[PDB]
């Protein structure tokens, strides 16, 4: 199941508008938007979330007319595994609860596997043999990633290629869902039919999703207890002291704490 909600996207003839429609649809299934803090929606709390509400599926197709279906965890927007035909593969979980939860995905698939690696960027970068800094994003990279995921089960994709493919999907789908800024970066690449690696503004934002989510949620009025350092496109560092500059940048936060009074507005 695969009775979880499914959102479809194809790279074939993809446009700025079709990509925007897709990311907006993904956000809509990740969270109801009923929990908002300082104008920014929060994903559902993992604690107490029923398994029938835990995942959504993204069915990706490309020009080669190959399809794969990614599973995303609504509590963190991240890719946890995928199905291609009669085989499904999952990142290695870190805890029993997550290991148990993924058994509820793709339950009719003939062949199920857990990868001998986790899906966090450190691990995927190590396997890929490159950092996010050197892995190009765009419609072209996504097209290739879909083919690579598709050919993995039959022995046709080596692990470093597979890891690179996951890094591409994760940033173009999960990180784009989490951040309007990164959705915008991907829109620009599609607009100009361009492939290019993410600059430091994107990578530091990705890394900081957790600490930004904590800083915003722990604030009564949106001012941070401690500033958080981000980077500009040219790599220079700056400090963020409150939520205001982040409202146009972050689309969704991971649940970190119950809302202090007034933090809902």
């Amino acid at each position: 199941p695969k009775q979880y909600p499914i959102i479809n996207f194809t790279t074939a003839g993809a446009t700025v508008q079709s990509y925007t429609n897709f990311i907006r649809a993904v956000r809509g299934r990740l969270t109801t938007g009923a929990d908002v803090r300082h104008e920014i929606p929060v994903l559902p709390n993992r604690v107490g979330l029923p398994i029938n509400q835990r995942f959504i599926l993204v069915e990706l197709s490309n020009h080669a007319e190959l399809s794969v279906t990614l599973a995303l965890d609504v509590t963190n927007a991240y890719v946890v595994g995928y199905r291609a035909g009669n085989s499904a593969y999952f990142f290695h979980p870190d805890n029993q609860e997550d290991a148990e939860a993924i058994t509820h995905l793709f339950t009719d698939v003939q062949n199920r596997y857990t990868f001998a690696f986790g899906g966090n960027y450190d691990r995927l970068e190590q396997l890929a043999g490159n950092l996010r800094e050197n892995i190009e994003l765009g419609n072209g990279p996504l097209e290739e990633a879909i083919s690579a995921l598709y050919y993995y089960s039959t022995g046709g994709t080596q692990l470093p290629t597979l890891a690179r493919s996951f890094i591409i999907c994760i940033q173009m789908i999960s990180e784009a869902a989490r951040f309007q800024y990164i959705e915008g970066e991907m829109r620009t690449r599609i607009r100009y039919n361009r492939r290019s690696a993410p600059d430091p503004s994107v990578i530091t934002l990705e890394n900081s999703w957790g600490r930004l989510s904590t800083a915003i949620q722990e604030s009564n009025q949106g001012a941070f207890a401690s500033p958080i350092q981000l980077q500009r496109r040219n790599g220079s560092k700056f400090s963020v002291y409150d939520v205001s500059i982040l409202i146009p940048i972050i689309a969704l936060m991971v649940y970190r704490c119950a809302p202090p009074p007034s933090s809902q507005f």
Partner: nanobody
Amino acid sequence: AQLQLVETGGGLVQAGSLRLSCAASGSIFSMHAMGWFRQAPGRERELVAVAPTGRPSDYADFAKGRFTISRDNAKNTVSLQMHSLEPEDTAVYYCNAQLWERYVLNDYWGQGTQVTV
């Protein structure tokens, strides 16, 4: 299972060396970075040097040349060798460990060690 950070090597010193060290224990699935920050009374907490996985060490301007960070990825230890210390470097020094957990990067902090110059 809970991450613990144990800091060593603080103390009193005078202008012109001192070495800090931190060892992490507990369930560590993926350590993205280990580093050292510092905070003086009446000032914000600030980065001194950080060693992110797979990348060059990142030093604050004031640490360039003077300080050297050293991370042992296998052992989850990080040390900071400081030379040419000034009174302006007086602060509480904190070890920072950044761990990927459930696909989110979480910060953890040592209890802090006083350095007085």
